[PDB]
Design a protein around this ligand. Structure first.
Ligand code: NI
Length: 341
């Protein structure tokens, strides 16, 4: 059955709760973003109302084939009414179309659900600042002090300079970026822009990108692999064997590959800075690991929560074991004692 952390008290609303069949009492199902864990169970066979951003609605319509009658897209930063209750969708700074939801309950309680988010100080000057938030449903993916990572902009700068140098040294080098879902598009778009190229990709991936309301998108991406010097492949193919194999397929138009694997955190965040990063190399193929994160680091998460000062925190990630929950509760109490709420 639907866990309590996916239910919004004193409404018949749920959030990211599509895998439990019909939820008893639920009149509106919210979807924060189009990542398979959160949408799990949604298909063309679903027949209840789904509330979401416009981008998330495009994806539901075109990729999952959910019938149009059940998709209720809402604009961002706008007070809207859903089944008699005031809501606001906010940018979550996660992947394209990802939202946080602010719920103003009839009794006067205010609840923020973050979805998946990368906390940022620009969130301290949104509609959130206008009133007290009593309960927070929090993306706790990286809720432990070891999880540090650079800014998105540091990582992009590094990727840009690396790619430009390599293709100026060898104009027959191909650049490859690994991918498995939406998110982290700035990586391949910024590399292509510095090389004066479109991004080449499969038909299914192009169809996904064509849903995301990216300005001038038709000038940036193509299905003609031949005509482009940046290619997207599945993350699973970003290894020496998969990359040599792809290079054979391109028809000797290229004689070298430089590849990037955007990952989350991995244990080499604890020593290295982004400027020290060096690739793994085998012959004419080099693979760079770059920690481009779309989740809050420990410090960004802590800052956001200490500003917000919620009366109760409800974790939404790593809640499956008591050890994890216990560990998280310890950090929440520390934050509260330091900040005086
Ligand atoms: Ni996500």
């Amino acid at each position: 059955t639907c866990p309590f952390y996916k239910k919004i008290p004193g409404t018949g609303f749920t959030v990211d709760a599509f895998q439990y069949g019909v939820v008893e009492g639920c009149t509106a199902y919210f979807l924060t973003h189009f990542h398979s864990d959160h949408y799990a169970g949604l298909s063309k066979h679903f027949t209840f109302p789904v509330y979401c951003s416009e981008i998330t609605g495009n994806l539901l319509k075109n990729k999952l084939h959910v019938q149009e009658q059940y998709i209720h897209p809402l604009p961002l930063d706008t007070e809207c009414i859903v089944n008699g209750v005031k809501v606001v969708l906010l940018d979550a700074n996660h992947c394209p179309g990802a939202v946080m939801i602010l719920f103003y309950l009839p009794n006067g309680t205010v609840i923020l659900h973050t979805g998946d988010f990368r906390a940022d100080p620009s969130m301290e000057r949104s509609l959130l600042a206008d009133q007290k938030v009593h309960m927070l449903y929090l993306d706790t993916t990286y809720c432990s002090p070891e999880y540090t990572f650079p800014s998105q902009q540091e990582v992009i700068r590094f990727a840009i300079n690396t790619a430009f140098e390599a293709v100026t040294l060898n104009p027959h080098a191909l650049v490859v970026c690994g991918t498995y879902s939406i998110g982290k598009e700035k990586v391949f778009l910024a590399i292509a822009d510095v090389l004066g190229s479109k991004v080449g990709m499969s038909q299914e991936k192009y169809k996904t990108l064509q849903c995301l309301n990216i300005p001038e998108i038709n000038s940036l991406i193509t299905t003609d692999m031949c005509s482009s010097l940046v290619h997207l492949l599945p993350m699973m193919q970003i290894n020496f064997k998969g990359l040599q194999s792809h290079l054979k397929k391109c028809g000797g138009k290229y004689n070298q590959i430089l590849a990037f694997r955007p990952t989350g955190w991995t244990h080499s965040n604890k020593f290295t800075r982004i400027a020290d990063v060096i690739p793994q190399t085998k012959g004419n193929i080099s693979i760079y690991g770059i920690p481009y994160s779309e989740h809050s680091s420990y410090l960004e998460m802590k800052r956001f929560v200490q500003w917000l000062k919620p009366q109760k925190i409800i974790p939404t990630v790593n809640v499956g074991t008591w050890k994890s929950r216990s560990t998280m509760e310890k950090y929440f109490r520390e934050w509260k004692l330091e900040a005086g709420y």
